[PDB]
From a paper:
Ubiquitin is a hub of the cellular interaction network. Previous work has shown that free ubiquitin consists of an ensemble of conformations, including the “bound-like” conformations seen in ubiquitin complexes, thus supporting conformational selection as the binding mechanism. We apply our framework to analyze the binding of the paradigmatic protein ubiquitin7 to its partner protein, the SH3c domain of CIN85. The interaction of ubiquitin and the SH3c domain is weak and transient (with dissociation constant Kd = 370 ± 15 μM from NMR titrations), akin to many other biologically important interactions.
The population shift can be calculated from the ratio of the dissociation constants for the “in” and “out” conformations and, thus, from the ratio of KdG53(D)T and KdG53A. The binding-induced population shift of the peptide-flip motion in our Markov state model is also small, in agreement with the mutational data. Besides the peptide-flip mode, an independent and similarly slow motion in our simulations and Markov modeling involves the flexible C-terminal tail of ubiquitin. Our Markov model constructed from 1.68 ms of binding simulations indicates that the population of the compact C-terminal conformation is strongly reduced during binding, and that this population reduction occurs prior to the transition state of binding, which is a clear signature of conformational selection. Unlike the extended C-terminal conformation, the compact conformation sterically obstructs binding of SH3c to ubiquitin. Consequently, the extended conformation of the C-terminus likely is the sought-after ubiquitin conformation selected for binding.
Numbering used by the authors: 1 to 73
């Protein structure tokens, strides 16, 4: 799959992901591409905040889904 991550400005980035990828794995991919520590990342899907120890499948996130990246720290 691919998914879309929108910053606060609306700057879109595309991520290559797997259905069984954890939120930590997604945070780690955003760190690789944008240099933000996972610690400082808040990820939001359909107004819901995604939590570590859960998969994209757990939250029903499918191909071409859109996550909102917000800064926590």
């Amino acid at each position: 799959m691919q998914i879309f991550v929108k910053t606060l400005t609306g700057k879109t980035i595309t991520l290559e992901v797997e259905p069984s990828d954890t939120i930590e794995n997604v945070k780690a991919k955003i760190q690789d591409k944008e240099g933000i520590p996972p610690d400082q990342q808040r990820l939001i899907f359909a107004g819901k905040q995604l939590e570590d120890x859960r998969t994209l499948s757990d939250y029903n996130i499918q191909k071409e889904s859109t996550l909102h990246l917000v800064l926590r720290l």
